[PDB]
RNA sequence: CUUUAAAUCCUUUAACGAGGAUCCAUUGGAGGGCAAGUCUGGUGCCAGCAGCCGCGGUAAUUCCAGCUCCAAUAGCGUAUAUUAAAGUUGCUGCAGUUAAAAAGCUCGUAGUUGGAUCUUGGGAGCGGCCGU
């Protein structure tokens, strides 16, 4: 602190109050703009409907094709490219399927090789994509 | 290379081996006892360096 | 340095500067321990005993060690008070 | 609005680094020595000691001959002494900090049932507790956490009801005796 | 295999005249022989290689990899040393750092939190130590607290024989060298912190250069 | 039987009730951080893994499996808010020559901070000059 007056409580509090806005992690949480522009509307997960299956070219170094899924969210009507996890799990996603969709892990930031894809597909037609991959549940059709 | 057509390539084309028949692993304190026996009661002071449990150099 | 029973428990008691009282650490290699020999007050010969002085490296690097031995030998009677 | 309690608290804390080799292999040294079943049984004891050891830190800040300290301190000392952890000779609360996890593991029923020699191992001891063969002052104790009061140590023996005592002989013997007379004819 | 001592202080220590590195540490003597510290604490000195660190001098024809070995040494009874040797391969570096660790060893003053009873368990007082950006503060703690520190200063403070301690660290502690050198520097300053205990002016005893001058003339040059 | 409005569960207690004790413990991992394979078979910058750094182009310690080992354990993983870690919001306690940063400079009102100085000696009593 740069005012050690005994009667300086408000300058020290009112400075700190003003300088907390220059923090990212604070400015984000304490404005509507981060919580509005969030496609999930501040929710953890979100059910949406697959409208196409999309190949996304991996980043500069490594070079695969990352199989993601273009999603119309129910609650918002908003557009999302959400990644599909492990080997050969895009074979489990028929078009126009209700998929439960979570974040990727970095609180709405793009992960690894996948440019501007912040989401993974968790369940497809209310059946878990780990259970389909392990073959425990069979896809109800 | 590889469009949407190559999905589940390598998962498909592995020689699918069925699991071996195991005497089932003991669970609870019977296990923690078995772990304690593998480490602190059995083994000897070794020349150079002590090896890892899964070690197969 | 002494316990409820009154035992000296620290594993050595340090020396400390005869000038400025600064304890003289185990790796202070600038530190200067001097023996100043005393003399028979009519013969003028080494008696066998000395007035031993110890300076910490720090004051010696400052260059004040000279004046600090000069004071410790004046207040010890080794050196003339008139000077 | 209901007539339910709700009051409940954790009895352990998970350690900060999950993979300290030095900790992982000192807590398995504890589990082997004293025949516990998981690291929760160790973090449970460590947590009770840490709460005791927190309360002690709190009383040593206070001035000597403080009424709250003298009352609270003696209350803590007579409790640790009563369970056989601390000594009557040593009941002074700067010794409570010089006190560790083996002192509490020694007083749990599993280890007393073993170190009285009415069990064959520490793992056999849990079996004898779990299988309700042992009692404490005509009370059959199912549970090996049971910390033994210092006065209540000598009253550990077999149940009057168990076949190890003067009890009704068990299921395997009685089936093998009936098969033995079904085998003889 | 046999030690033939070169320096004056090494000669005395082999010839049994001075028998405690306490007595060496009192007159603030340089210890340059390796076997001196191997002679007095020998059947207790334990080694932990904290880190092997590949450094690289860029040359005309590609990088030139040398290996630093950081070795903390100490008995679990009030002596630590922190040796860093940079060499061509790791075997030579580790061996050379062990020798430098030995040559570095300081005494640790250890004191009490509150009740001065039994043996000292913790640091006598708050000591700070620095190296580069790193600042390692040590604070005394009550009995059974252990060392509340990162894995690097734990390995030193445990080797120092300090049973209990609260640490703090600021700056790039990820630079293990600076972080081990700071916590070593902090420990070192325990017998360089004037407490009230050491207010009584010293009864200046006699150097083993002066005490055993008569032996040194006939035994060596 | 007990429980209880009547039951249930618990406790008690006849009888049955265990050798693959099949009365079958999972969940995640095993390059580093981070505990634990430079094992074997497949793939060949593909498929995929991968919080980050990275692994994958024909001896893959990282993918897909087998065996094995580790960790927590009737639980264990994941997404998201939030706390500590963050002395990366700093009152305790951060920074501002060059890493982000001192207004171009000065005056100036509220705000904040503000020099030294105004009573001391002994009277009464105890313990072994000092103590209450």
UniProtKB/Swiss-Prot annotation, chain A:
MF (Gene Ontology): structural constituent of ribosome
PTMs per UniProt: Hydroxylation at Pro-61 affects translation termination efficiency.
Keywords: Acetylation, Cytoplasm, Endoplasmic reticulum, Hydroxylation, Isopeptide bond, Nucleus, Ribonucleoprotein, Ribosomal protein, Ubl conjugation
Covalent cross-link site, Glycyl lysine isopeptide (Lys-Gly) (interchain with G-Cter in SUMO2): 36
Annotated Gene Ontology cellular component terms: cytosolic ribosome; nucleolus; rough endoplasmic reticulum; small ribosomal subunit
Location(s) in or outside the cell: Cytoplasm, Cytosol; Cytoplasm; Rough endoplasmic reticulum; Nucleus, Nucleolus
N6-succinyllysine sites (modified residues): 53
Main location: cytoplasm
InterPro entries named in the record: NA-bd_OB-fold (IPR012340), Ribosomal_uS12 (IPR006032), Ribosomal_uS12_euk/arc (IPR005680)
Keyword Acyltransferase belongs to the record: no
Chain residue ranges for the region called Disordered: 1-25
Modified residues (N6-acetyllysine): 134
GO BP terms in the entry: translation
One Pfam assignment: Ribosom_S12_S23
Modified residues (3-hydroxyproline): 61
Ranges annotated as biased composition (Basic residues): 1-19
Function summary: Component of the ribosome, a large ribonucleoprotein complex responsible for the synthesis of proteins in the cell. The small ribosomal subunit (SSU) binds messenger RNAs (mRNAs) and translates the encoded message by selecting cognate aminoacyl-transfer RNA (tRNA) molecules. The large subunit (LSU) contains the ribosomal catalytic site termed the peptidyl transferase center (PTC), which catalyzes the formation of peptide bonds, thereby polymerizing the amino acids delivered by tRNAs into a polypeptide chain.
Family per record: Belongs to the universal ribosomal protein uS12 family.
Name of the protein described by the UniProt record: Small ribosomal subunit protein uS12
Taxonomic lineage of the native organism: Eukaryota, Metazoa, Chordata, Craniata, Vertebrata
Gene: RPS23
UniProtKB/Swiss-Prot annotation, chain B:
Disulfide bonds listed in the record: none
List of residues that carry N6-succinyllysine: 49
Signal peptide residues on this chain, from the entry's feature table: none
Domain of life, per lineage: Eukaryota
Cellular localisation: Cytoplasm; Nucleus
Subunit structure: Component of the 40S subunit of the ribosome.
Role according to the record: Component of the 40S subunit of the ribosome. Contributes to the assembly and function of 40S ribosomal subunits.
Designated name of the protein: Small ribosomal subunit protein eS30
Organism: Oryctolagus cuniculus
Taxon lineage: Eukaryota, Metazoa, Chordata, Craniata, Vertebrata
Span covered, complete protein: 77 to 133 of 133
Swiss-Prot record, chain C:
GO molecular function, one term: structural constituent of ribosome
One Pfam family hit: Ribosomal_S21e
Residue positions where N-acetylmethionine is found in the record: 1
One record GO biological process: translation
Keywords from the named record: Acetylation, Cytoplasm, Endoplasmic reticulum, Isopeptide bond, Ribonucleoprotein, Ribosomal protein, Ubl conjugation
Name of the coding gene: RPS21
Subcellular location: Cytoplasm, Cytosol; Cytoplasm; Rough endoplasmic reticulum
Signal as UniProt keyword: no
Species this protein is from: Oryctolagus cuniculus (Rabbit)
Protein's UniProt keywords contain NADP: no
Classification via Gene3D superfamilies: 3.30.1230.20
Family: Belongs to the eukaryotic ribosomal protein eS21 family.
Name of protein: Small ribosomal subunit protein eS21
Subunit structure: Component of the 40S small ribosomal subunit.
Curated annotation (Swiss-Prot), chain D:
Region (Disordered): 161-185
Modified residues (N6-acetyllysine): 65, 115, 154
Annotated SUPFAM superfamilies: Alpha-L RNA-binding motif
Location in or out of the cell: Cytoplasm; Nucleus, Nucleolus
Gene Ontology CC annotation, any one: cytosolic ribosome
Gene3D superfamilies named among the record's database cross-references: RNA-binding S4 domain
Domain S4 RNA-binding residues, every copy: 107-181
Glycyl lysine isopeptide (Lys-Gly) (interchain with G-Cter in SUMO2) crosslink, residue number(s): 92, 138
Superkingdom of this protein's organism: Eukaryota
Modified residues (Phosphoserine): 152, 162
Presence of the UniProt keyword Nucleotidyltransferase in the record: no
GO biological process: ribosomal small subunit biogenesis; translation
Predominant localisation class: cytoplasm
Molecular function terms from GO: rRNA binding; structural constituent of ribosome
Keywords on record: Acetylation, Cytoplasm, Isopeptide bond, Nucleus, Phosphoprotein, Ribonucleoprotein, Ribosomal protein, RNA-binding, rRNA-binding, Ubl conjugation
Keyword Cytoplasm assigned: yes
Assembly with partners or alone: Component of the small ribosomal subunit. Identified in a IGF2BP1-dependent mRNP granule complex containing untranslated mRNAs. Part of the small subunit (SSU) processome, composed of more than 70 proteins and the RNA chaperone small nucleolar RNA (snoRNA) U3.
PANTHER family in the cross-refs: 30S 40S RIBOSOMAL PROTEIN, SMALL RIBOSOMAL SUBUNIT PROTEIN US4
Family: Belongs to the universal ribosomal protein uS4 family.
Protein name (record): Small ribosomal subunit protein uS4
Species in which this protein is naturally found: Oryctolagus cuniculus (Rabbit)
